[PDB]
Amino acid sequence: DTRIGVTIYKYDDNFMSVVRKAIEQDAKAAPDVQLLMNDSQNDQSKQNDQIDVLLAKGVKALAINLVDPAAAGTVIEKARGQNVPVVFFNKEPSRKALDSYDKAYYVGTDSKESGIIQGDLIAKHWAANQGWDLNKDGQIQFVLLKGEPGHPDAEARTTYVIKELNDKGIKTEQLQLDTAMWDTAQAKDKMDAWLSGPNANKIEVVIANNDAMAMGAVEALKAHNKSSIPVFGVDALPEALALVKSGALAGTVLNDANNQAKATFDLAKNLADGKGAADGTNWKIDNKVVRVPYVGVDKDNLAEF
Numbered sequence: 001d002t003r004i005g006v007t008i009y010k011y012d013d014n015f016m017s018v019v020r021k022a023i024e025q026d027a028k029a030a031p032d033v034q035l036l037m038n039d040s041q042n043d044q045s046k047q048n049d050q051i052d053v054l055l056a057k058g059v060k061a062l063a064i065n066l067v068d069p070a071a072a073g074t075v076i077e078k079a080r081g082q083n084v085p086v087v088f089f090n091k092e093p094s095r096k097a098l099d100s101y102d103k104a105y106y107v108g109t110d111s112k113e114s115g116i117i118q119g120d121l122i123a124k125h126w127a128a129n130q131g132w133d134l135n136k137d138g139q140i141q142f143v144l145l146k147g148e149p150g151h152p153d154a155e156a157r158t159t160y161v162i163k164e165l166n167d168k169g170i171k172t173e174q175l176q177l178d179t180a181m182w183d184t185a186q187a188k189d190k191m192d193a194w195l196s197g198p199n200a201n202k203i204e205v206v207i208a209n210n211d212a213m214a215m216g217a218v219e220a221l222k223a224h225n226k227s228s229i230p231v232f233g234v235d236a237l238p239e240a241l242a243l244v245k246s247g248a249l250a251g252t253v254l255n256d257a258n259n260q261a262k263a264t265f266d267l268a269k270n271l272a273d274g275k276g277a278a279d280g281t282n283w284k285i286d287n288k289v290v291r292v293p294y295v296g297v298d299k300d301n302l303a304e305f
């Protein structure tokens with residue numbers, strides 16, 4: 001049986017929970033694969049030790065969701081010594097890191113695209129819901145819940161949601177902006193703070209860089225009897241889709257966990273087998289990278305997900 005080792009940066013990250021469960025199902029369909037999957041508990045030192053163990057166990061490929069993207073070289077050097085291929089996923093290593101090893105690959109997304117799509121989606125719903133412009137000024141007064149500072153998906157979603165609105169002629173006014181570190185509880189706390197501060201009843205739209213944080217904002221709005229304020233996320237988590245259907249979330253953007261898991265598995269299995277990474281598949285690998293598209297989601301198209 002071919003052993004494939006997988007490290008997940010943090011099991012209880014909502015999005016990576018969807019990804020890891022999907023990878024488990026791809027591996028279950030491969031009768032000759034034993035999956036060795038680890039929770040790194042948000043600590044790169046723990047992950048490094050897990051990789052040593054996976055290599056001791058003779059895995060034929062590694063699929064690595066880094067805690068710290070800067071540790072890509074550390075991981076590569078472990079793998080190099082055993083000639084083991086590494087498919088990094090979701091936390092993007094640098095170009096130089098990928099180019100340092102002939103058997104390093106990456107599966108992820110075009111981070112900018114999700115921000116653009118989210119801004120276009122907000123624009124559509126803004127146009128359709130003129131009552132959302134509480135102060136009648138033609139501008140969106142917003143608050144924004146950011147992911148981890150320096151994470152490329154947080155930075156791009158934060159920049160491009162606003163750029164896209166502004167580029168379409170929709171002026172925006174940032175009433176509050178802070179990180180909630182991708183986390184529901186932190187986002188509920190932060191949103192509750194904003195609902196307790198001087199801008200509370202000026203807020204017209206809540207923009208979150210992911211669904212977990214959007215969900216925390218939804219909870220805080222409910223507690224304040226302000227559920228009429230729309231909230232937008234990114235990921236299209238199953239739980240978030242249920243909230244789109246119920247009207248509690250105004251819209252989101254699919255971060256396609258199923259295809260990211262499938263590509264990661266397929267590439268890792270091919271490489272474990274000594275084949276070309278994309279053999280037998282339709283994955284498009286561009287200079288060692290696969291990027292899976294995002295798709296905007298709201299009630300009108302929900303049943304396609």
Ligand SMILES: OC[C@H]1O[C@@H](O)[C@H](O)[C@@H](O)[C@@H]1O
Nearest residue numbers: 013015090153182210235255
């Ligand atoms: O790296 C982890 C992060 O990846 C992003 O692409 C997701 O949208 C976030 O929900 C997740 O927290």
Ligand SMILES: [Ca+2]
Nearest residue numbers: 135137139141
């Ligand atoms: Ca306004």
